[PDB]
Design an enzyme around this catalytic site. Structure first.
Site, PDB file in Angstrom:
ATOM      1  CB  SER A   1       3.945  87.154 -42.218  1.00 12.32           C
ATOM      2  OG  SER A   1       3.715  88.369 -41.532  1.00 12.32           O
TER       3      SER A   1
ATOM      4  CE  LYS B   1       4.483  90.130 -44.358  1.00  8.41           C
ATOM      5  NZ  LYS B   1       5.041  90.375 -43.012  1.00  8.41           N
TER       6      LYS B   1
ATOM      7  CD1 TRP C   1       8.562  92.108 -39.199  1.00  3.78           C
ATOM      8  CD2 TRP C   1       9.752  92.781 -37.426  1.00  3.78           C
ATOM      9  NE1 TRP C   1       9.710  91.352 -39.150  1.00  3.78           N
ATOM     10  CE2 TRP C   1      10.457  91.746 -38.071  1.00  3.78           C
ATOM     11  CE3 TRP C   1      10.312  93.368 -36.287  1.00  3.78           C
ATOM     12  CZ2 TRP C   1      11.687  91.280 -37.609  1.00  3.78           C
ATOM     13  CZ3 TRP C   1      11.534  92.906 -35.833  1.00  3.78           C
ATOM     14  CH2 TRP C   1      12.207  91.874 -36.492  1.00  3.78           C
TER      15      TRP C   1
ATOM     16  CB  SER D   1       8.292  88.587 -41.877  1.00  8.32           C
ATOM     17  OG  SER D   1       7.050  88.038 -42.178  1.00  8.32           O
TER      18      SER D   1
ATOM     19  CG  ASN E   1       4.509  93.629 -41.550  1.00  7.21           C
ATOM     20  OD1 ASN E   1       4.022  92.670 -42.150  1.00  7.21           O
ATOM     21  ND2 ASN E   1       4.679  93.637 -40.248  1.00  7.21           N
TER      22      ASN E   1
ATOM     23  CD  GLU F   1      -5.518  97.103 -41.578  1.00  9.14           C
ATOM     24  OE1 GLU F   1      -4.751  96.722 -42.486  1.00  9.14           O
ATOM     25  OE2 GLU F   1      -5.368  98.197 -40.989  1.00  9.14           O
TER      26      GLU F   1
ATOM     27  CB  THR G   1       7.675  82.214 -40.391  1.00 11.67           C
ATOM     28  OG1 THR G   1       8.154  83.547 -40.604  1.00 11.67           O
ATOM     29  CG2 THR G   1       8.873  81.280 -40.203  1.00 11.67           C
TER      30      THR G   1
ATOM     31  CB  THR H   1       3.911  85.079 -36.138  1.00 11.02           C
ATOM     32  OG1 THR H   1       4.960  84.174 -36.460  1.00 11.02           O
ATOM     33  CG2 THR H   1       3.571  84.920 -34.658  1.00 11.02           C
TER      34      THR H   1
END
Ligand SMILES: [Cl-]
Length: 270
Positions: free
Chosen positions: A47, A50, A82, A107, A109, A145, A212, A214
């Protein structure tokens, strides 16, 4: 070179205890001194793309004055796992600026995928990074993906060094006009997902913004940040991790520890 790793730090022991690989690049923007460990290896972005996506939106807004306040409506099909902010505005829509803030600070999505579509997809974000001089970054796929973090796969990766160099250009350099630059900084400063990563190494009385990432597999997680220690020039840094086995766990503590070592290597008292 001459100012690189003037002081050695035990990154090797840290990554061995973690059971994987840690990549670090940290730049003192005053002197040009750097700390560098596996800094030119590729690591999955997860992520962390972003943040650069929001910068790309801000860059486009320099040419499109109405862009940030444009309302975007979306269907339930746009809500991917998320999406903590965009799920609350499904029935109303959000502006481009709100989607950008959600992508950076939560974050989110769904927000990231909507913005990626606006920019022309992964190749469009890659083109923006090329436009600022980053030849390493590549985005290839969409959420979720892009999180596969497959060992040896260069898709959806960059290097810690290129991440830091691009972050410096966007937050402190001339890649964005001054209003957009400060908005990018403000979104990073408002991030809510990084309290256990680089921020855990930064004293409370210093300003910091971060993004961040993950991936959820292969012990793969990361953070990049601009940090403003009081009384000296800002520091830009990136910390990326990965591990050889799909079920290896990531560690926030290892990211924070690597950030501490980077600040120590730069002689920044924390
Ligand atoms: Cl985490």
């Amino acid at each position: 070179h001459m100012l690189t790793n003037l002081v050695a730090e035990p990154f090797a022991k840290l990554e061995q205890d973690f059971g994987g690989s840690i990549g670090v690049y940290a730049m003192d923007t005053g002197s040009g001194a750097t700390v560098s460990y596996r800094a030119e290896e590729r690591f999955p972005l997860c992520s962390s793309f972003k943040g650069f996506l929001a910068a790309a939106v801000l860059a486009r807004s320099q040419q499109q004055a109405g862009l940030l306040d444009t309302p975007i409506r979306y269907g339930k099909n746009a809500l991917v796992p998320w999406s903590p902010i965009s799920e609350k505005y499904l029935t109303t829509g959000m502006t481009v600026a709100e989607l950008s803030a959600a992508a950076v600070q939560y974050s989110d999505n769904a927000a990231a995928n909507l913005l990626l579509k606006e920019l022309g997809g992964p190749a469009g974000l890659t083109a923006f990074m090329r436009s600022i001089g980053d030849t390493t970054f590549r985005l290839d796929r969409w959420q979720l993906e892009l999180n596969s973090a497959i060992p040896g796969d260069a898709r959806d990766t960059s290097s810690p060094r290129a991440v830091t160099e691009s972050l410096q250009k966007l937050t402190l350099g001339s890649a964005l006009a001054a209003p957009q630059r400060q908005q990018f900084v403000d979104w990073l400063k408002g991030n809510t997902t990084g309290n256990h990563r680089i921020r855990a190494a930064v004293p409370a009385d210093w300003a910091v913004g971060d993004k961040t990432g993950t991936c959820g597999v292969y012990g793969t997680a990361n953070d990049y940040a601009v940090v403003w220690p009081t009384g000296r020039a800002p520091i830009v840094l990136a910390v990326y991790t990965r591990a050889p086995n799909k079920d290896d766990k990531h560690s926030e503590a290892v990211i924070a520890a690597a950030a501490r070592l980077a600040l120590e290597g730069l002689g920044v008292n924390g």
